[PDB]
Amino acid sequence: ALVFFAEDAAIIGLAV
Amino acid sequence: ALVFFAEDAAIIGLAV
Amino acid sequence: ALVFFAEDAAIIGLAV
Amino acid sequence: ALVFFAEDAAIIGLAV
Amino acid sequence: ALVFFAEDAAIIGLAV
């Protein structure tokens, strides 16, 4: 799976 | 809001 | 075009 | 009450 | 770029 990144603060992984 | 990042050059934020 | 980044592990670009 | 401010990005209030 | 600030509520940045 791909992991994208976003600032949510902390930088989190969004796993697809 | 989440902030994604993209290379547009320079790296930019994209706010959601 | 925009390039997003994703961890595929190595970091890859995703071009749009 | 007092409202303080912090950078979180976005600036948020903190109410006391 | 300079970033000014304004209460719009929430405090927001104005980028120049």
Next chain:
Amino acid sequence: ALVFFAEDAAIIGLAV
């Protein structure tokens, strides 16, 4: 309306 801030000292608002 936007409220900007300035030191006039004390901090005042400038409303627009």
Next chain:
Amino acid sequence: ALVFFAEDAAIIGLAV
């Protein structure tokens, strides 16, 4: 001394 800021409305200093 440090001076912090709070919305009390006016913005006031808090002196430490």
Next chain:
Amino acid sequence: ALVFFAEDAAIIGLAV
């Protein structure tokens, strides 16, 4: 004279 504020990083005064 009025002093406004901007992020330039560091927050700077702009004096008018």
Next chain:
Amino acid sequence: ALVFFAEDAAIIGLAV
């Protein structure tokens, strides 16, 4: 983390 602000003069961040 949260970043507060204080006059130290110039404004500085305070990271928590």
Next chain:
Amino acid sequence: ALVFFAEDAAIIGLAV
């Protein structure tokens, strides 16, 4: 200050 980034996993900021 400049903020660099590293994986420590999750991404974290490194302030300089």
Next chain:
Amino acid sequence: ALVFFAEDAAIIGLAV
């Protein structure tokens, strides 16, 4: 050369 990245806010390159 290698290009590192830092948040300065805009993301900037540092070329080595």
Next chain:
Amino acid sequence: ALVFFAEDAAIIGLAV
């Protein structure tokens, strides 16, 4: 160990 990132063009890890 910390992993930093650099554009070398692919993005590579730098392992410390």
Next chain:
Amino acid sequence: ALVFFAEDAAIIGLAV
């Protein structure tokens, strides 16, 4: 434009 809704807490609009 379409305005979607999401819990971010507080419910926000997202405007498209």
Next chain:
Amino acid sequence: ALVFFAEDAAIIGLAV
């Protein structure tokens, strides 16, 4: 408790 929703602008909870 039950939480209803109203536009007040922003969408708010109403707790019962």
Next chain:
Amino acid sequence: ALVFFAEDAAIIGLAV
């Protein structure tokens, strides 16, 4: 800071 330019003759900087 930003430096704009104007003909004043001779071309001058205007610093902000």
Next chain:
Amino acid sequence: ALVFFAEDAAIIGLAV
């Protein structure tokens, strides 16, 4: 004639 411009500091004209 044509007047080009160069930074010499100050911006100067170069007349051709």
